[PDB]
From a paper:
The outer mitochondrial membrane protein [name], known for its role in mitochondrial fission, has been reported to interact with the ER-resident protein [name]. [name] is a single-pass integral membrane protein anchored in the OMM through its C-terminal transmembrane (TM) helix. [name], an alternative protein binding partner of [name], is an integral polytopic ER membrane protein. [name]_ΔTM exhibited the six antiparallel α-helical repeat bundle structure known as the tetratricopeptide repeat (TPR)-like fold for protein binding.
The presence of both [name]_ΔTM and [name]_vDED in some crystals was confirmed by sodium dodecyl sulfate–polyacrylamide gel electrophoresis (SDS‒PAGE), and a crystal structure containing [name]_ΔTM and [name]_vDED (residues 168−233 + 234SAAA237; denoted as 168−233 + SAAA) was determined. The crystal structure contained three molecules of [name]_ΔTM (chains A, B, and C) and four molecules of [name]_vDED (two [name]_vDED dimers, chains D−E and F−G) in an asymmetric unit. Two individual coiled-coil (CC) dimers formed by four [name]_vDED molecules (chains D−E and F−G) interact independently with two [name]_ΔTM molecules (chains A and B) in the asymmetric unit. The remaining [name]_ΔTM molecule (chain C) in the asymmetric unit did not interact with any [name]_vDED molecule. The C-terminal region (from Asp224 to the C-terminal end) of the [name]_vDED helix in the CC dimer bound to the convex side of [name]_ΔTM, which consists mainly of α3 and α5 helices. The concave surface of [name] did not participate in the [name]−[name] interaction. In particular, there is only one salt bridge and only one hydrogen bond between [name]_ΔTM and [name]_vDED: between the side chain of Lys64 (chain B, [name]_ΔTM) and the side chain Asp224 (chain F, [name]_vDED) form a salt bridge, and the side chain of Lys89 (chain B, [name]_ΔTM) and the main chain carbonyl group of Ser234 (chain F, Ser234 is Gln234 in the wild type (WT) [name]_vDED) form a hydrogen bond; when analyzed with chain B ([name]_ΔTM) and chain F ([name]_vDED). Since the buried surface area was only 273–361 Å2 (~3.4–5.3% and ~4.5% of the total surface areas of the [name]_ΔTM and [name]_vDED structures, respectively), the interaction between [name]_ΔTM and BAP 31_vDED is likely very weak, explaining the impaired complex formation in the SEC experiment. Interestingly, although [name]_ΔTM + [name]_vDED crystals were grown under acidic conditions (pH 4.5), the C-terminus of [name]_vDED had a defined helical structure.
Numbering used by the authors:
A (entry chain A): 1 to 120
B (entry chain C): 2 to 67, 69 to 102, 105 to 121
C (entry chain B): 2 to 120
D (entry chain F): 170 to 235
E (entry chain D): 169 to 233
F (entry chain G): 179 to 235
G (entry chain E): 179 to 236
The structure:
Amino acid sequence: MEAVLNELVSVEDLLKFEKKFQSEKAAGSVSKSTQFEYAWCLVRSKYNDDIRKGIVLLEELLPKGSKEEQRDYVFYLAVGNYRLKEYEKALKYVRGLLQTEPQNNQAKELERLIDKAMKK
Amino acid sequence: EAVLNELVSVEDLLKFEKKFQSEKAAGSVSKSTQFEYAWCLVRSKYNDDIRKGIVLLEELLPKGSKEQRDYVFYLAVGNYRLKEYEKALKYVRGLLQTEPNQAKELERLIDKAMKKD
Amino acid sequence: EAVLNELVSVEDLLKFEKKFQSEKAAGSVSKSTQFEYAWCLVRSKYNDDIRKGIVLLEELLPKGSKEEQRDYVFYLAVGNYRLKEYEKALKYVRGLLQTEPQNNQAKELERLIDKAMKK
Amino acid sequence: VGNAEVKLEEENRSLKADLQKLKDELASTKQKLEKAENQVLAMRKQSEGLTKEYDRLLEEHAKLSA
Amino acid sequence: DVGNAEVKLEEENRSLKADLQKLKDELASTKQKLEKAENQVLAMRKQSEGLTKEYDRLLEEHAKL
Amino acid sequence: EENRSLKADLQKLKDELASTKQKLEKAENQVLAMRKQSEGLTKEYDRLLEEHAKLSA
Amino acid sequence: EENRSLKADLQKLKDELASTKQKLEKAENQVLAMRKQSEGLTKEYDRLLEEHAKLSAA
């Protein structure tokens, strides 16, 4: 199943990106792209602690981001909060991102998913 | 095809929003571009999109060249899609009085949807 | 619902044709009106309409700006796909995808053209 | 002294001739420049005509490709 | 008259000496205050560096909950 | 001294002639660019001619 | 006249004192901005405190 390939590639990504992140943290500052790579692997992982670590890394990178970079960070924060079923924070990030980009179809479908899950 | 319709709808929404913002950054927004944006918006499947389209159409309504008939028609459509049937009927009646020959089936639909509830 | 879709398609074709002729009679036709008209022609169910819309889009190609020519090429691909002119549809969509490699809408359009070509 | 006046009048008539030649060359250059401007004007006219030509040629090519 | 003029000379003279002394004292006070203001600002930037990590840990705990 | 006024006028004339020479050379470069453009139009028109001949056969 | 030297040095002293007055004005502007940011920190912290206490009161 595609799920087996996905899980094995997830394990490889997690290992190698954690290695790069830790190598950069041990020797001086960690670059923004490496921290983003790590958080991006983390929020797509199947472990919820991994998604939490990715959300933390994205929130830490958020203030020292550029223009497009903070929009990407907010998109992935919405994704991560959606996956942890923290639908309000997901809705906050996706509504902010859609306020700065009204017709990003991906963030519109993401907010659609969050709203569909919020109705209980 | 539903896929073709969805893809062209997303492209229209994206690119006309981009044109709207590009023209808004540098001075006034053109009437034709804002109409295109609002009309794509009222044809969208997201309710917020129809709300934005109705707002833009109403803001094109005052200083129009009589095309106010199209603006009122699309306002009726947008209000109908949001289940705001009254304004749909009001705009469709205004347009029908200005034209003795479209929107009659729109009136039919508004009335049947008011009868359904 | 579908009835509403049909009624707005009919209103669009009629009134945009009317405005096209109104601007054609008195001097130059605006590019926005011609684009609206072709936008409607390529959505009609008559193949002659899609042919006319493709003609208007090709006429509008040199007059468009950087982003307008991309939209024109997108709709040329759409119109040729709908007329089963898969060669020209593929050509325009690949031209467009060279300047925007990850426009997912044009990727799904090319995929529709390819699946119809292999069938 | 008389030699000096003779030389003076020599340089004098030479100066008159050189001034005449400069005036003539100026007139000729000016006429040539203005006719060049007329040429350029006609060319811009034909450029706009070429725009119309391209409009019609493109319309025919599109109607034939369809 | 000489007498009055030399008296006035020394009067202006001692007055100038006093004004210069006062100017020097006020200069010393202002410089000292500026210097310790710089000291405060340095400590404050240090506490800003600390506040960054404080916010990081706050985020990590909020996420853990 | 009329000769001094003459020589001042002549120095001004030399300056203005230098300036007209530079403007002439620059107009020449602009016309050369327009000629490059006309040649480009010519070649593209020949290609379109071949295309039209293909469409006619 | 070395009294004129005193007068010229005092003119320079007045110039530099105007510069120092503008110095303190500008430094006060910067400190005021720092104050505004500190107060924003405090208010945001208070809102976070309310949220944390609400989570605790569960």
